[PDB]
Amino acid sequence: TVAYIAIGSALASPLEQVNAALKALGDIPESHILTVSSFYRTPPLGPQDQPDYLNAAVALETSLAPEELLNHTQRIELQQGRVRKAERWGPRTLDLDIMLFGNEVINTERLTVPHYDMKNRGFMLWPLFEIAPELVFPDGEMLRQILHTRAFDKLNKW
Numbered sequence: 001t002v003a004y005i006a007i008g009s010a011l012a013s014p015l016e017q018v019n020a021a022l023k024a025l026g027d028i029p030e031s032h033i034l035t036v037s038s039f040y041r042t043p044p045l046g047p048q049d050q051p052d053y054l055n056a057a058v059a060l061e062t063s064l065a066p067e068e069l070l071n072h073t074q075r076i077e078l079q080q081g082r083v084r085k086a087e088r089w090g091p092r093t094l095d096l097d098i099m100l101f102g103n104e105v106i107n108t109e110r111l112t113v114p115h116y117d118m119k120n121r122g123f124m125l126w127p128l129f130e131i132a133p134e135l136v137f138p139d140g141e142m143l144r145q146i147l148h149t150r151a152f153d154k155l156n157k158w
């Protein structure tokens with residue numbers, strides 16, 4: 001099954017963290033990375049003190065169950081998702097979200113797939129479009145269609 005995973009980092013200098021996360025994703029059991037989008041920059045839409053976010057999308061082939069994949073992405077967030085500076089470990093700055101899991105619809109306490117808000121987010125749609133321009137959602141909606149309708153601005157590369 002092809003799973004599409006969104007990567008977000010809130011770090012001032014996120015490349016190291018994002019690379020560590022990518023390596024960890026590739027090490028997930030019964031899985032391998034198919035492709036990785038470019039890294040995209042998105043400024044904060046509010047308090048401008050916050051660093052730009054780094055966004056990307058990953059296609060992962062997996063034989064794991066969706067909730068098993070979630071266990072792994074959540075583990076990676078716990079293991080690579082925080083950075084120490086000086087005398088303190090920072091809070092979670094890495095976000096790994098399952099956007100799509102094959103052509104499956106999931107609605108459990110732990111998992112909503114397709115991701116509940118991705119259709120509102122250029123920062124999740126554009127990297128996904130780069131790696132899966134012909135993508136069709138489980139309900140028959142098309143990624144191209146959503147981008148065409150909402151006219152979200154393209155993202156600058158990191």
Ligand SMILES: Nc1ncnc2c1ncn2[C@@H]1O[C@H](COP(=O)(O)CP(=O)(O)OP(=O)(O)O)[C@@H](O)[C@H]1O
Pocket residue numbers: 095096097098099109110111112113114115116117
């Ligand atoms: N598709 C999905 N991918 C990842 N986590 C998901 C998910 N659907 C539901 N969740 C749930 O989301 C819960 C909270 O995850 P968080 O990462 O803290 C939310 P976030 O990603 O910061 O915001 P967002 O969901 O608005 O993008 C998890 O405990 C997990 O069970």
Ligand SMILES: [Cl-]
Pocket residue numbers: 107
């Ligand atoms: Cl529902």
Ligand SMILES: [Mg+2]
Pocket residue numbers: 095097
């Ligand atoms: Mg998120």
Ligand SMILES: [Mg+2]
Pocket residue numbers: 095096097
């Ligand atoms: Mg999340």
